[PDB]
Design an enzyme around this catalytic site. Sequence first.
Site, PDB file in Angstrom:
ATOM      1  N   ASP A 153     -30.118  51.594   2.648  1.00 40.96           N
ATOM      2  CA  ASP A 153     -31.309  51.020   3.000  1.00 40.96           C
ATOM      3  C   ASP A 153     -31.222  49.785   2.363  1.00 40.96           C
ATOM      4  OD1 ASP A 153     -33.913  50.474   4.024  1.00 40.96           O
ATOM      5  OD2 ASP A 153     -35.078  51.751   2.565  1.00 40.96           O
ATOM      6  N   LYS A 186     -31.623  46.066   2.027  1.00 41.41           N
ATOM      7  CA  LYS A 186     -32.807  45.104   2.478  1.00 41.41           C
ATOM      8  C   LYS A 186     -33.443  44.035   1.569  1.00 41.41           C
ATOM      9  CE  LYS A 186     -36.919  47.781   3.123  1.00 41.41           C
ATOM     10  NZ  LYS A 186     -37.028  49.033   3.979  1.00 41.41           N
ATOM     11  N   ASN A 220     -36.098  45.449  -1.051  1.00 42.82           N
ATOM     12  CA  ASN A 220     -35.491  46.318  -2.122  1.00 42.82           C
ATOM     13  C   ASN A 220     -34.812  45.397  -2.941  1.00 42.82           C
ATOM     14  OD1 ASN A 220     -36.706  48.313  -0.586  1.00 42.82           O
ATOM     15  ND2 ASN A 220     -34.883  48.818   0.274  1.00 42.82           N
TER      16      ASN A 220
END
Length: 388
Positions: free
Chosen positions: A190, A192, A195
């Site tokens: 995850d 991106k 984050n």
Amino acid sequence: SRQRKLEALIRDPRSPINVESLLDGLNSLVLDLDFPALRKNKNIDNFLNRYEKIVKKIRGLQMKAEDYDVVKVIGRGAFGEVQLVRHKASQKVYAMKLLSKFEMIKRSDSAFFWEERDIMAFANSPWVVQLFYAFQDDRYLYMVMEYMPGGDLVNLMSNYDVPEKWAKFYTAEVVLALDAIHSMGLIHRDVKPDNMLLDKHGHLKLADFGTCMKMDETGMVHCDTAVGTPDYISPEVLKSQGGDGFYGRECDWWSVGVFLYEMLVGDTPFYADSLVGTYSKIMDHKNSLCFPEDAEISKHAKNLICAFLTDREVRLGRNGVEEIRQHPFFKNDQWHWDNIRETAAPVVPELSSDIDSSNFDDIEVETFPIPKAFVGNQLPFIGFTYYR
């Protein structure tokens, strides 16, 4: 032969049966039984007559939400909020994330945080945001984390036209961070800009880990659920929804490609009006990827992006992080890979005080039903509590 091994397990702060986990186990059991309906059972009533009093007392000595001052709210997820807080006694500033126990039970998604807690607690890396305290009350989980006052990259990219000099830097820091996570035996899944948070000096730390997973001895996961957020998800992860998918860490490098593309071009490669639109493009990436004529991009940058945005089988970083580092795009005069995180970042945040939240945007009632028989709504959260 020995209870020497036993004692060892209880003291290890990584262990699922350390003293704090055991107290979570006793506290959660009392919270799940203490309802008029259940106390009609003798066993349950007798138990609670012994432990109810002492458990209240214990819970009072425990770290609480009321030990912190809420300065302001700086983020809201689907499961709760993120608060800029100042701890009252110490006077120190943290970022505190709250996860609603109600919303996690309800949405059937109540075990994602174990990896996130572990990574933040014990990574001890400059690339990973640090967790200082994890605690709970009957309604919330709390994670007291180091505050990142530079905001995220989704905010940086939206306030600047990003030149390549900058993208080299930010991409490289993402590459080292991800390599750090991989060397702790974990795939991020995850990656991106939401984050990726900027510390005080304008350098980067990875901040969210709710989709992480441990690899095998071999380096792979077996996972049959597609995860992460659509625009940045790799084809192999998306494919694995159908069943028996079998991927390694190269899925994260795809996401770096998507990130690098977005930073230079201004939109995500597989952007679409709908979700199923974006998914249909990612699957058809060999045909759907292309750079607009006008958004002008170096041939090395364009190359690095395409080297990431291909099939797993030939993706840059299948042979290891080494071939990524030597890609010509990263050549520059400011930093090498051993010292990047002590050179001057391209944007140093301007801050007035230790509670300046100016790089975050502004932001603007729910209880478990009383049970009949025994539902065990607190059992998923036994072992969460952690003190530094």
